[PDB]
Design a binder for this molecule. Structure first.
Ligand SMILES: [Ca+2]
Ligand SMILES: [Ca+2]
Ligand SMILES: [Ca+2]
Ligand SMILES: [Ca+2]
Ligand SMILES: [Ca+2]
Length: 313
């Protein structure tokens, strides 16, 4: 079931790759074609071995070098690829929080689409890395029921997929129905517990029972794919309970639709899911948007930044 687009390069030699990269950057200029094609055909653990090998051979730091040589969206994309996989979501989360304001989009996206296993690991790396708790930094930045629901999801304690209790499926479908009709503005406490704590197989049966009660799908009610942090989060959780590859396909779609490109979302999803389910996200994208992701990127992006995203894709 989950398939990535980037795997370990067979016949890898970290020293040989350290030398190619050194050659590509040494002296006047920069060979971006060579950097781009090597780093998108190596997996993230191999990139860490190349950095190690580059410091042993040359006494230089590879990422600081990539950063002085490269520029703009291509530099942002190569810097993201060099981030150890284990640290990347934690990094993104620290940067949505830190500073004035907060970037709610990244906050909703990663806490709603990551599994409990991913989240236990994220919370642990964040503390170790940044010295504060993710939970505390979230409570310091967010407010109201949006804050509460983030904290519920950050406990990473959803019920197990086990005994499906239809009395409880019926009860909960009813409550969501009643909450939906009231525009998710009334028994917040009641519904936040159902969305953050029930098992995924229970909630899929609930969403189906909601359908037969209302005549429609629950995202039609929460649908205002714009405005209000908790509703955006309710929509991201519902879509992710249904299919995380489908929900990330859609956030990709919407990063490129309209005037502009949200390149930050486009790098973040492309890089974070490259070795997990980016293949699944590709199939979902074509299936729901009747265009491949490749072609959507190709029309939306330019230069070596485009060359590198199309090789990851
Ligand atoms: Ca140079
Ligand atoms: Ca050049
Ligand atoms: Ca350069
Ligand atoms: Ca902040
Ligand atoms: Ca666009």
């Amino acid at each position: 079931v989950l398939r990535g687009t980037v795997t370990d390069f067979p016949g890898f030699d970290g020293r040989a790759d350290a030398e190619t990269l050194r050659k590509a950057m040494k002296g006047l200029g920069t060979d971006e074609e060579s950097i781009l094609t090597l780093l998108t055909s190596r997996s993230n653990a191999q990139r860490q071995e190349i950095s190690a090998a580059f410091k042993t051979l040359f006494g230089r730091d590879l990422l600081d070098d990539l950063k002085s040589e490269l520029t703009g969206k291509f530099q942002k994309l190569i810097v993201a690829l060099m981030k150890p996989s284990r640290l990347y979501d934690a990094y993104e989360l620290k940067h949505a929080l830190k500073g004035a304001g907060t970037n709610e989009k990244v906050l909703t996206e990663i806490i709603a689409s990551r599994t409990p296993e991913e989240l236990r690991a994220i919370k642990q790396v964040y503390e170790e890395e940044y010295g504060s708790s993710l939970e505390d930094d979230v409570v310091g930045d967010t407010s109201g029921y949006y804050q509460r629901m983030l904290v519920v999801l950050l406990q990473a304690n959803r019920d197990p997929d086990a005994g499906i209790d239809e009395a409880q499926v019926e009860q909960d479908a009813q409550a969501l129905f009643q909450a939906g009709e009231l525009k998710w503005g009334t028994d917040e406490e009641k519904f936040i517990t159902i969305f953050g704590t029930r098992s995924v197989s229970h909630l899929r049966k609930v969403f189906d029972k909601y359908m037969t009660i209302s005549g429609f799908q629950i995202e039609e009610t929460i649908d205002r794919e714009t405005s209000g942090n908790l509703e955006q989060l309710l929509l991201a959780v519902v879509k992710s309970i249904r299919s995380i590859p489908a929900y990330l396909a859609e956030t990709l779609y919407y990063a490129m639709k309209g005037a502009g490109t949200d390149d930050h979302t486009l790098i973040r999803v492309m890089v974070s899911r490259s070795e997990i389910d980016l293949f699944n996200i590709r199939k979902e994208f074509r299936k729901n948007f009747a265009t491949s992701l490749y072609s959507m990127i190709k029309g939306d992006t330019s230069g070596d930044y485009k060359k590198a995203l199309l090789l990851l894709c």
